[PDB]
């Protein structure tokens, strides 16, 4: 339906989305630390040679500067695609994102805006990243009205979601699961296409329990659904949330109304994690339908450890066990 496709891994699908964007939008620019030579994860390879040094360029090493600068470009109406090297380093720009970007349109009565800003950043665990190359900071941003937060689960999803973010008329933060950058490839349209924001995706229909996740964790819950079918004869509905904020409350509630059970999982720490917002909302909307307490299987309330990573992550065994207990409730 999308024209000719090519097998692409995540980093390739991101370059493809970026290339498509600069091609059709002459105002678009890409900037950040080390993006000129192609980026530390190869997501910008060939772009500077194709579009020019004034359109794909390095900034000084300063995240608050990168986002403030991007907001300023967007204030003029030009498309600004900023890169934050690792999501773990987005915090120096927290004030520019939360106090500035998110409130720009509102506070000016729509006289000014930075809707044409997109911030993209590597995200999630990577096996050995430890405290500062593994973070999943979406819940910190989920409490800020005015920005959209989007996380893909695959190359096809990434290109379509990123193009939607770039084109959206609101500041967007796009988190790319770095462990997937050079993982398996999948068919990705060479030409631009969009995947809607604020729309979750039911990737597998089920009747006994609803499983919700995003990023790499969607693959974990897909495996959990397989394990539950084989070991317990339980039918799981697997859902990819995709957009953290504004989230697709309707798709999730409709599923839980049918199944009566819900398990949400995320690599980020449990306390104040985004699963708490989904759980609270579902309990409020589907009280009559819930047969068991809602389960949250997340990373522990610690910093992200180096040597202990295998014990920290909410893996398939942890999720499966929680699901078994919830089903037997």
């Amino acid at each position: 339906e999308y024209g000719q496709t090519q097998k692409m891994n995540l980093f390739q699908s991101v370059t493809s989305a970026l290339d498509n964007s600069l091609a059709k939008d002459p105002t678009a620019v890409i900037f950040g630390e080390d993006v000129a030579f192609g980026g530390v994860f190869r997501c910008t390879v060939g772009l500077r040679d194709k579009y020019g040094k004034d359109r794909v360029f390095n900034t000084p090493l300063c995240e608050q500067g990168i986002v403030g600068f991007g907001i300023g470009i967007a204030v003029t109406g030009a498309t600004a695609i900023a890169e934050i090297q690792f999501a773990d380093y987005i915090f120096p720009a927290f004030d520019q994102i939360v106090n500035e970007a998110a409130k720009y349109r509102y506070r000016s009565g729509d006289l000014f805006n930075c809707g044409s800003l997109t911030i993209r950043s590597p995200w999630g665990c990577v096996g050995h990243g430890a405290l500062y190359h593994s973070q999943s900071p979406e819940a910190f941003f989920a409490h800020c009205p005015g920005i959209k937060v989007v996380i893909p689960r695959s190359p096809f999803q990434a290109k379509g979601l990123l193009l939607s973010c770039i084109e959206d008329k609101n500041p967007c933060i796009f988190f790319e699961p770095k462990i997937l950058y050079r993982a398996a490839a999948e068919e990705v349209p060479i030409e631009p296409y969009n995947i809607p924001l604020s729309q979750a995706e039911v990737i597998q229909e089920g009747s006994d329990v609803t499983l919700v996740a995003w990023g790499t964790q969607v693959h974990v819950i897909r495996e959990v659904a397989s394990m539950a079918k084989e070991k317990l004869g339980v039918s799981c509905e697997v859902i990819d949330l995709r957009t953290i904020i504004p989230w697709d409350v309707d798709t999730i509630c409709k599923s839980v109304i049918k199944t009566g059970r819900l398990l949400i999982s995320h690599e980020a720490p449990l306390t104040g994690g985004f699963a708490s917002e989904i759980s609270s909302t579902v309990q409020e909307e589907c009280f009559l339908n819930l047969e068991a307490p809602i389960s949250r299987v997340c990373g522990y309330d610690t910093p992200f450890p180096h040597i202990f990573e295998p014990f920290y992550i909410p893996d398939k065994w942890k999720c499966y066990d929680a699901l078994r207990k919830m089903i037997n409730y």
Partner: protein, 383 residues
């Protein structure tokens, strides 16, 4: 010869630390003395009578408005206010040197820039009252002005955040071949923020047509400059970032005009940033929330210049004082009588398009007000 990529220099065979020159800092550029006399004819901009009268009347109309709104805040008619006393010359002198389409980013104490650009008194008042005529829709605190039409980016409270933003806007302008400059105003206190460092560096490395204008008024609320920095003010920071810098007498509209005019010409032509530190004094309270007693005027100086040219007199002064007061009061009284905007406006513009969950909250309020409305000031708000 040294071969290091990071710097271009020669070797030295004796250990010598570089001392800052703070006691004898960068000199203060001044065109006219305290008696309004041009000190060096070569520096006279020879601005036409109509232009100089506009500079004078903009400064005085702003002072008149400040007095009235400051009093309005003391009476509790507006929730907050910040005056511009002693700084009117930095605003009008710099605004006059720009093209009217040059984009301005400010802090909150640059209302004279808008006054010079003919922002209606009605709109200054509407923002202070948060009434239906406010293009900001009553969402921000008083003095948080913005004007798309007059290229003045809406003010925000977080200090220095506009600095790297102004740089981004200047980069975009450069790309667009606009032949436009961006000016970014901030105080000496705000200059201590990390965002100032970000902005200054980015403008130089990315070669942006921007003028950084620092209002150095001696205090950041209760904090004197001796507790703010130890180098030679803000102007001395410019060269270390590779930025052409200058310090001017902020109480001299002509010195401010001259420095801004030259910075603009070169910023646009060379795509290079310029830094102007205007020295003044914060004559009024930091704000209506501050009592400054707990811790050479631009208007009089220009008035003496005007008298010297035969361009003003005591009679014209009296008549303008009267007319300006009537104009401000007219706008003030109109502003007070207008209702506030519809409470529904609390929910729009959060995103361009209203998310369904946000509309649900809007509907929640509507239902709440239908049942508990008597407990709300519905009569003072639109519809």
């Amino acid at each position: 010869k040294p071969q290091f990529p990071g710097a271009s220099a020669e070797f030295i065979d004796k250990l010598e630390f570089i001392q800052p020159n703070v006691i004898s800092g960068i000199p203060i550029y001044r065109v006219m003395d305290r008696q309004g006399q041009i000190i060096n004819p070569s520096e006279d901009p020879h601005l036409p009578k109509e232009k100089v009268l506009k500079l004078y009347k903009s400064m005085t109309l702003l002072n008149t408005m400040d007095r009235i709104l400051y009093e309005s805040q003391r009476q509790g008619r507006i929730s907050f206010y910040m005056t511009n006393y002693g700084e009117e010359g930095t605003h009008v002198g710099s605004a006059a040197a720009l093209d009217n389409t040059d984009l301005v980013f400010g802090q909150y104490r640059e209302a004279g820039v808008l006054m010079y650009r003919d922002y209606p008194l009605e709109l200054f008042m509407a923002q202070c009252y948060g009434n239906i005529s406010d293009l900001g829709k009553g969402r921000q605190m008083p003095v948080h002005y913005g004007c798309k039409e007059r290229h003045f980016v809406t003010i925000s409270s977080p200090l220095a955040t506009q600095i790297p933003q102004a740089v981004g806007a200047a980069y975009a302008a450069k790309r667009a071949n606009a032949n436009r400059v961006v000016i970014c105003y901030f105080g000496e206190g705000a200059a201590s923020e990390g965002d100032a460092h970000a902005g200054f560096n980015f403008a130089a490395t990315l070669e942006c047509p921007i003028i950084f204008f620092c209002r150095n008024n001696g205090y950041a609320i209760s904090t004197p400059t001796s507790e703010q920095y130890r180098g030679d003010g803000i102007a001395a920071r410019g060269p270390g970032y590779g930025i052409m810098s200058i310090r001017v007498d902020g109480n001299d509209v002509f010195a401010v005009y001259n420095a801004t005019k030259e910075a603009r010409r070169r910023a646009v032509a060379e795509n290079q940033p310029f830094l102007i530190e205007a020295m003044t004094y914060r004559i009024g309270h930091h704000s209506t929330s501050d009592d400054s007693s707990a811790y050479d005027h631009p208007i009089s100086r220009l008035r003496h210049y005007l008298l010297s040219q035969g361009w003003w007199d005591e009679e014209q002064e009296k008549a303008w004082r009267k007319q300006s007061r009537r104009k401000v009061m007219e706008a003030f009284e109109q502003a007070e009588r207008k209702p506030k905007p519809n409470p529904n406006l609390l929910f729009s513009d959060v995103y361009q398009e209203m998310p369904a969950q946000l509309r649900k909250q809007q509907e929640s309020l509507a239902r709440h007000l239908q049942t508990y409305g008597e407990h709300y000031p519905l009569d003072h708000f639109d519809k």
